[PDB]
Design a protein around this ligand. Sequence first.
Ligand SMILES: [Ca+2]
Ligand SMILES: [Ca+2]
Ligand code: NA
Length: 700
Amino acid sequence: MASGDVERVYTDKSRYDPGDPVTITAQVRNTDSIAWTGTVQLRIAHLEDQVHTASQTVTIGGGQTEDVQFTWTSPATDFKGYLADIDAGALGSGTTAIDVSSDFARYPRYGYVSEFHPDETAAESAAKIDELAQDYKINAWQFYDWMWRHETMIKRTGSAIDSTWIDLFNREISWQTIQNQIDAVHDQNGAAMAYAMIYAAREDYESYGVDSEWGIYQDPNHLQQLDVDFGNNSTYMYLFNPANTDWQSFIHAQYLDAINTAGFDGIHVDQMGQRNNVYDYWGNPLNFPATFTPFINEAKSTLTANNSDKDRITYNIVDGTVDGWAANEVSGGADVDFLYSEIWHLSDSYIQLKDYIDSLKANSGNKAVVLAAYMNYRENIGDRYEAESAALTNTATNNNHSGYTGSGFVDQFADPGDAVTFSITVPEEGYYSLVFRFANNSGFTATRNLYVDSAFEIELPFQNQPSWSAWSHETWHQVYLTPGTHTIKLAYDAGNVGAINLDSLTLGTFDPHSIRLANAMMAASGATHIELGEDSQMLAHEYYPNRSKSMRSELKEALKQHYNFITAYENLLFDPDVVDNDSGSQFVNLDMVSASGDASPNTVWHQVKRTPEYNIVHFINLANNDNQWRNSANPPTLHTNIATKVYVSPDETISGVYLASPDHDDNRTQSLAYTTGTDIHGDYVAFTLPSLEYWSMVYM
Ligand SMILES: [Ca+2]
Ligand SMILES: [Ca+2]
Ligand code: NA
């Protein structure tokens, strides 16, 4: 009785040049008591075609996990996704995608780095980079808030680069850590993109060589420069004019310093979004969104002159939507290598988001599109533990303010020696986000010390709110926990301040249902999603270090599948020749399953696309859910054996009907039996979809 499983399959790089050798590794576990000897088979497909096989005999000891490796010379034709399948017979199987692309900008799969601690060792830097590359095919990383000051990015004493420096939120950043992450990125053939603002400088900017004549103002008399107040009467960002050629000259030299000193491949240029009624120093009104494209193009040219292998650029189109602010200007005129857009509430539905991605493509000559679209934003979702049901220590229960959940909340939480002790149960080893719902109208920030299984973790702040009924869940802390029972104690110890009312503790959890639907919708429309970073953290908020939610292992598995599916089938998703097919919503029929062509709520949404070689039908299952992409969702209504008709041209040629999904069979393509026929409505191909859970793709 042989037994086991392939735990992980990955490649040595997230991207390859045509002709590069690819090393594919199956991590194969023998779960039997004794050693297994057997054949392990590699099959590599390109879409429906089997292109390579290989075989070897291996022995794997009882209870052991062994890396089984194959090597493959990638074919010499550029821009090709493949699927590598490793079959170990009785010990199971697994797949991974292979991406052959000379230019990552064609198929960006963008993640992030936000943590640059001195105590992060090279091995830890390499492990978080390697995990993202291996499991999600990430080929580019945005290094978020690596810089010292927004206008002076590397901190120097004379000509020596400081070993560490302190960022705008008082975080300690190590130069060596940044460098080690960059090298680990390059070891995956990745691109390392340096975050920077288009137009920002920190306080006292006159001392760092920046002229206040370059700024932008709320009035024509240069009185009030546009700023961001961080609310401590000290830390500000001041805004400047992207059209001003001296600001350009200063800030583009900083970009080059980042390229040349750290080895970044390019610049991720951010902005704050829509500002109205804006003036330069001299009191001239600015067409503000029209300044961005000249800045970007000059930036691109400056970067290309410095180093044409490390000249990458993108610019964040904030609050993206059809004809949104700066959207047509940037997508239609700016030499970004790929488009990037932060989505807020002007494209809330699937179809609105689709319409936006389509317009970015049409404007830009089918550039890649990456979307920042923070899933489940501000939802206090996950396992909830009510504070009034916890173990109380010199604190009591009450109900005399509006807005609590459960039967009440903890109050008389104002003195040293007072505490609240939650007793939680977690189903697996991993990160858990402790999210505290509380009130505080003390007039000032309160603080408590947090303890986990009796041992001190950290001191947490609790911001003051306008009233005792304005609750907040914006105090959170992530911890790493083993399965089963744990104790979570919030304490007023000596040296803590303020009174607070405590509603609950929630284990902040990303919802997989929404996340899988959104990712499917974006990929079916030709965009990817910046969401993964660090050691499989996910973006919960625009400030990337926010850990207010954590992913559970079932979501991490689904994301691995999804991210490999969009790499292996990248030629049917993101190539410039992938276009919507003109025909409307009676192009496709699903017998006795409600469907739409327009992402209607509670329907199987079908979308028909085509290349020169293939016709493509996407099915995205919105059954049991609405049409809004961001918000947590129900499990979709599972469908089985859907009698499907796809109406086709009488001319069009048809060799077979192929099915693949990130939901079933490790992204492998399945050939489906089908018939051709004609009826009242026209010529069709008929076939049965065996199942539909989130997203299935049929090609022919
Ligand atoms: Ca409560
Ligand atoms: Ca929804
Ligand atoms: Na139907």
